[PDB]
Design an enzyme around this catalytic site. Structure first.
Site, PDB file in Angstrom:
ATOM      1  N   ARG A 183      -2.305 -21.705  -7.211  1.00  0.00           N
ATOM      2  CA  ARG A 183      -1.472 -22.584  -8.512  1.00  0.00           C
ATOM      3  C   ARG A 183      -0.197 -21.404  -8.626  1.00  0.00           C
ATOM      4  O   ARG A 183      -0.471 -20.581  -8.535  1.00  0.00           O
ATOM      5  CB  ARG A 183      -1.963 -23.635  -9.684  1.00  0.00           C
ATOM      6  CG  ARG A 183      -0.345 -23.645 -10.406  1.00  0.00           C
ATOM      7  CD  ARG A 183      -0.503 -22.616 -11.515  1.00  0.00           C
ATOM      8  NE  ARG A 183       0.464 -23.101 -12.224  1.00  0.00           N
ATOM      9  CZ  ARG A 183       0.744 -22.533 -13.378  1.00  0.00           C
ATOM     10  NH1 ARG A 183       0.298 -21.054 -13.772  1.00  0.00           N
ATOM     11  NH2 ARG A 183       1.489 -22.873 -14.547  1.00  0.00           N
TER      12      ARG A 183
ATOM     13  N   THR B 170       0.528 -14.843 -20.283  1.00  0.00           N
ATOM     14  CA  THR B 170       2.097 -14.234 -19.981  1.00  0.00           C
ATOM     15  C   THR B 170       2.839 -13.555 -20.654  1.00  0.00           C
ATOM     16  O   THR B 170       1.701 -13.374 -21.665  1.00  0.00           O
ATOM     17  CB  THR B 170       2.733 -15.360 -19.740  1.00  0.00           C
ATOM     18  OG1 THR B 170       2.297 -16.143 -19.242  1.00  0.00           O
ATOM     19  CG2 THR B 170       3.943 -14.490 -18.936  1.00  0.00           C
TER      20      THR B 170
ATOM     21  N   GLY C 279       3.074 -20.534 -11.675  1.00  0.00           N
ATOM     22  CA  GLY C 279       4.347 -20.508 -12.508  1.00  0.00           C
ATOM     23  C   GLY C 279       5.130 -20.108 -12.038  1.00  0.00           C
ATOM     24  O   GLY C 279       5.574 -19.644 -11.273  1.00  0.00           O
TER      25      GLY C 279
END
Lengths: 144, 134, 134, 144
Positions: A29, A1, A31
Site C-alpha cells: 500500500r 506523516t 499513499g
C-alpha cells in the site's frame, strides 16, 4: 506523516514528505506521501505545498500541485489551500461519501514567505518558524 | 519577504522545525533544512506515523514512503521501502544519483551506504499482534 | 458534442482504439472501453513497451505499471508488478475493492483471480542479454 | 507505454495507462504511468489527458494534471497540451538541460469531445476514433 516546506535566506524553496503510511495496511500500500503531484510540490518561481491526511483523497485530487497552481493564478497561500480543500469537499459529495470519514490538511508557502493552511476537519495544526520564532497555528476547516 | 521560514504538518512539526531552523538561521539551504527537520521525526520511535516506530502493515512489515523536491525541479521518491530508518535521505540519494519502490529501493539504499535496521519497535510489534486478535 | 470519442498514444493506439470502439459504438461505458483497448496491447507480445511484450529491467524482471481513472474520481494503480499480463485490470480491481506496488500488488492480483504468467518472451530475454554485454 | 482516454455516449470520461516502463531500468524503477498526477488524469466535469515521453519529466511536471487544470481555466484541449509543453520547455531550460534529450507530450479530450495534442519533439503520433472513424494524427511540437 510529516510534510515540511521551507524558504531559505537565498529565496529558494524545498520540501520533504515522509511516512510509515496507514497502520496495518495491505502489503505494498502506497499513499500520497511519496508522490510529487500529491503529498509534495515545489516550484521555485511560485511556492511550495505539502499535504497529509487520507492518502487516497490527496492522490485522487493531485492536491499540492493544485495548491501551487492556485498560487500561480494569484491566490494567497491560505486561499490556495482553502480552494483545494473545497475541491476535495465537492468530490467527496459527488462520490456520495461522508466528509467525516476523510481528513486532509494542506500547508503552503509562496516566494515572498507568505504562508497558509486549510484542512477538512478540525484538529489539524501546523508549525511555522520564522525570524519572530516558532509557532503552532490552527487553520480554518471546512466541516462545520 | 519573510525569510527564512519553515512550515510543517502536525504538532510534532513544532520540534521538527527547531531542527530545520538550525540550518536556516545560519543561511543554509532549504533542501538541507527540510531533510534534517523530517529526519528528527523519522528517528523518533515514539512517533508511530513516521520512520522508526512506524506502525507496520498487516503482515508486520514496516514499509516507508518519502519524497523530496529542491528549488530546481529535482525530485526523488521511495515507496514501500523496508529496513532503512531515514527514507527521506534515500529519496535524496535517488534525486542526486526519480522513484524506486519495494526491494529495489532497499537495494539502492544499501548501495549508497545506508544500513539495514529493524524498524519494528517492541511497542509497535505488540500493538500489531493485538490488532490481529480482532 | 462529439461523442463517443477515444484517443490513445502511438501507432499501436490505432489498433487499441478499434477494440475500444467495439464498446463505445454500442453505448458502452468509457471505463470498459479504455480497459479493453489497452489490454489489446498488454496481450500482444510483439508490443514491447506494454505488458507481455515488455523489455525487462536490468536484472531481467518484467515489471509493469498501470493506472485507471473513471468518471467519478475513482482511481486504482499498480506499480512494479510482476507476472500478471493485464496490470490495467489489476488496477481496475484496486479501484473497485488506491496504489499497490511490488510483491503486494501481485499478492492482491492473485487474490482476485488473476494468474501468474511468464511475461519474458524469448525475444526480450535475448535482447536483455545483448544489452548486458555492452 | 499506452495511454487511452475516452468520452462515451453518456458524456462520461475515463482513462487507462499501462506500461512495461524503461527498458533495462533499475529494479524497482517506477515512471509516470501509474501516477495519477502524471501519466493520466480524468475529471469528469472538465476533461482527460494522458502523457508520452520520458517518465521522470512527466512526473516532475505533474503533466496531465496541469493539462486538465488548463482546460478547467478554459483552454481548449489543444491549447492546454501546448501550454503544458511550453511551461515544461521553460523548466527544462531552468534546469540547464537540452530539449533534444527530453520528450514530453500529451493528448487531451474535454467534455464536449474536442481533442488536442502537443509534444516537445516531432515524431510522436496518436490515434483518434469518433464517428468519422479511426485515424493517426501528428500534433504540433515545440522543438523547431
Amino acid at each position: 506523516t510529516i510534510g515540511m516546506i521551507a524558504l531559505d535566506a537565498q529565496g529558494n524553496l524545498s520540501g520533504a514528505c515522509t511516512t510509515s503510511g496507514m497502520a496495518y495496511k495491505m502489503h505494498g500500500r502506497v499513499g500520497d506521501s511519496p508522490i510529487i503531484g500529491a503529498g509534495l510540490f515545489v516550484d521555485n518561481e511560485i511556492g511550495a505545498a505539502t499535504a497529509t491526511g487520507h492518502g487516497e483523497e490527496v492522490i485522487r485530487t493531485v492536491g499540492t500541485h493544485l495548491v501551487v497552481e492556485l498560487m500561480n493564478q494569484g491566490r494567497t497561500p491560505q486561499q490556495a489551500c482553502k480552494e483545494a480543500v473545497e475541491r476535495i469537499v465537492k468530490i467527496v459529495n459527488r462520490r456520495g461519501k461522508n466528509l467525516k470519514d476523510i481528513q486532509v490538511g494542506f500547508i503552503a508557502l509562496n516566494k515572498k514567505g507568505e504562508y497558509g493552511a486549510y484542512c477538512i476537519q478540525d484538529g489539524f495544526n501546523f508549525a511555522v518558524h520564522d525570524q519572530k520564532g516558532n509557532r503552532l497555528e490552527t487553520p480554518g476547516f471546512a466541516l462545520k | 519577504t519573510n525569510k527564512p521560514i519553515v512550515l510543517s504538518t502536525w504538532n510534532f512539526g513544532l520540534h521538527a522545525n527547531v531542527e530545520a531552523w538550525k540550518v536556516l538561521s545560519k543561511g543554509g539551504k532549504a533542501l538541507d533544512a527540510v531533510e534534517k527537520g523530517v529526519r528528527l521525526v523519522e528517528d523518533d520511535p515514539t512517533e508511530r506515523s513516521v520512520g522508526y516506530g512506524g506502525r507496520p502493515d498487516r503482515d508486520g512489515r514496516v514499509t516507508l514512503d518519502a519524497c523530496i523536491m529542491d528549488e530546481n525541479y529535482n525530485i526523488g521518491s521511495v515507496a514501500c521501502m523496508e529496513h532503512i530508518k531515514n527514507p527521506i535521505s534515500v529519496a535524496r540519494a535517488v534525486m542526486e544519483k526519480v522513484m524506486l519502490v519495494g526491494d529495489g529501493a532497499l537495494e539502492f539504499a544499501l548501495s549508497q551506504g545506508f544500513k539495514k535496521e529493524n524498524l519494528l519497535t517492541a511497542e509497535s510489534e505488540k500493538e500489531w499482534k493485538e490488532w490481529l486478535k480482532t
